[PDB]
Amino acid sequence: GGLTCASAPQGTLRILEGPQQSLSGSPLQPIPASPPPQIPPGLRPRFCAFG
Amino acid sequence: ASRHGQKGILSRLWPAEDMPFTESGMVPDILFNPHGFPSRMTIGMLIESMAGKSAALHGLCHD
């Protein structure tokens, strides 16, 4: 009436919960790159010679 | 000193009438010997001079 060893298991199942990968879009930056410093339009000379 | 590691002592206070005046009437207030560039390669000072002169001329502020 006691507990005895039974037949060895024939296989093992290991369960884990996993989600999946999306598409590669690689959206690097809101406003991207190093935007260049640049000329103010027209500007004009702010200096003249004497005479 | 400048913002580029070019430190130096003040050796003279040159009279304001003995300074080399420019064709615009101006007269520098700092005289910096041009021989600190060749061995120290602080090309950022030569760009800061032009950037600051352009800023003072156009009323701008460059980065």
Curated annotation (Swiss-Prot), chain A:
<feature type="modified residue" description="Phosphoserine">
    <location>
        <position position="26"/>
    </location>
</feature>
<protein>
    <recommendedName>
        <fullName>DNA-directed RNA polymerase I subunit RPA34</fullName>
    </recommendedName>
</protein>
<feature type="region of interest" description="Disordered">
    <location>
        <begin position="18"/>
        <end position="41"/>
    </location>
</feature>
<comment type="function">
    <text>Component of RNA polymerase I (Pol I), a DNA-dependent RNA polymerase which synthesizes ribosomal RNA precursors using the four ribonucleoside triphosphates as substrates. Involved in UBTF-activated transcription, presumably at a step following PIC formation.</text>
</comment>
<feature type="modified residue" description="Phosphoserine">
    <location>
        <position position="34"/>
    </location>
</feature>
<comment type="similarity">
    <text>Belongs to the eukaryotic RPA34 RNA polymerase subunit family.</text>
</comment>
<feature type="compositionally biased region" description="Pro residues">
    <location>
        <begin position="29"/>
        <end position="41"/>
    </location>
</feature>
<comment type="subunit">
    <text>Component of the RNA polymerase I (Pol I) complex consisting of 13 subunits: a ten-subunit catalytic core composed of POLR1A/RPA1, POLR1B/RPA2, POLR1C/RPAC1, POLR1D/RPAC2, POLR1H/RPA12, POLR2E/RPABC1, POLR2F/RPABC2, POLR2H/RPABC3, POLR2K/RPABC4 and POLR2L/RPABC5; a mobile stalk subunit POLR1F/RPA43 protruding from the core and additional subunits homologous to general transcription factors POLR1E/RPA49 and POLR1G/RPA34. Forms a heterodimer with POLR1E/RPA49. Part of Pol I pre-initiation complex (PIC), in which Pol I core assembles with RRN3 and promoter-bound UTBF and SL1/TIF-IB complex.</text>
</comment>
UniProtKB/Swiss-Prot annotation, chain B:
<protein>
    <recommendedName>
        <fullName>DNA-directed RNA polymerase I subunit RPA2</fullName>
    </recommendedName>
</protein>
<comment type="similarity">
    <text>Belongs to the RNA polymerase beta chain family.</text>
</comment>
<comment type="subunit">
    <text>Component of the RNA polymerase I (Pol I) complex consisting of 13 subunits: a ten-subunit catalytic core composed of POLR1A/RPA1, POLR1B/RPA2, POLR1C/RPAC1, POLR1D/RPAC2, POLR1H/RPA12, POLR2E/RPABC1, POLR2F/RPABC2, POLR2H/RPABC3, POLR2K/RPABC4 and POLR2L/RPABC5; a mobile stalk subunit POLR1F/RPA43 protruding from the core and additional subunits homologous to general transcription factors POLR1E/RPA49 and POLR1G/RPA34. Part of Pol I pre-initiation complex (PIC), in which Pol I core assembles with RRN3 and promoter-bound UTBF and SL1/TIF-IB complex.</text>
</comment>
<feature type="binding site">
    <location>
        <position position="7"/>
    </location>
    <ligand>
        <name>RNA</name>
    </ligand>
</feature>
<comment type="function">
    <text>Catalytic core component of RNA polymerase I (Pol I), a DNA-dependent RNA polymerase which synthesizes ribosomal RNA precursors using the four ribonucleoside triphosphates as substrates. Transcribes 47S pre-rRNAs from multicopy rRNA gene clusters, giving rise to 5.8S, 18S and 28S ribosomal RNAs. Pol I-mediated transcription cycle proceeds through transcription initiation, transcription elongation and transcription termination stages.</text>
</comment>
